[PDB]
Paper text:
Here we present new structural data for an IBP identified from a cold-tolerant fungus, Antarctomyces psychrotrophicus (AnpIBP). The structure of AnpIBP consists of a 45-Å-long β-helical fold with a triangular cross section. The main constituents are 6-ladder β-helical loops, which are supported by a long α-helix located along the β-helical axis. The AnpIBP uniquely binds to the water molecules that participate in the primary and secondary prism planes, which were detected as a prism ring in the FIPA experiment.
Numbering used by the authors: 1 to 203
Write the structure that this text describes.
Amino acid sequence: TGLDLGAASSFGALAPQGVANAGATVINGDMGTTGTSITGFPPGLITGQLHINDDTSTQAFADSRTAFVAGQALIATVDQAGTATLGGNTFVAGVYKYDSAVGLDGVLTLDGAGDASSVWVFQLATTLVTYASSSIILTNGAKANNVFWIVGSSATLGTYSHLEGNVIANALIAAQTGATINGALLAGSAVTLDSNTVTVQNS
């Protein structure tokens, strides 16, 4: 249902070049790297399995990149061209193409329109920045596990923000103080965390 994440599907945080944590983070999911050590656990903790450079982390990373490539290759159903803002919108299922840096200030609503099989793929050509206390919400049967944020460079999740979905970034994912995620942080470089909660979702 949407992009196949393969062995990456159980990970809350996956980054080849490490996960660097500050504060009382809780990862409800697996965590891995391709060999780089993680730092800041404790005081962080994970409730799933740690996979630092084993067969699972190699296959999970490869699968995360396969999904990134497939996500970028999809034909857009909605061309948003140079639109810079996501906040204050209600989006039905689609592949949404954004050509430049996007921000989310306020609330974004993902409307399943009564169909739980609804898929969202956000094709963000460069950066994603979510603002402080921003939120993504699900209505009318939308499922977090069917939402994909395909971030063309790096994602910055703002302080005390809330995100639903699978963040598949080409490079860095930074979750600022208190950001919460129902989904996953699948980075192409590093993940930085500060007092976050990440909970992996199923569909």
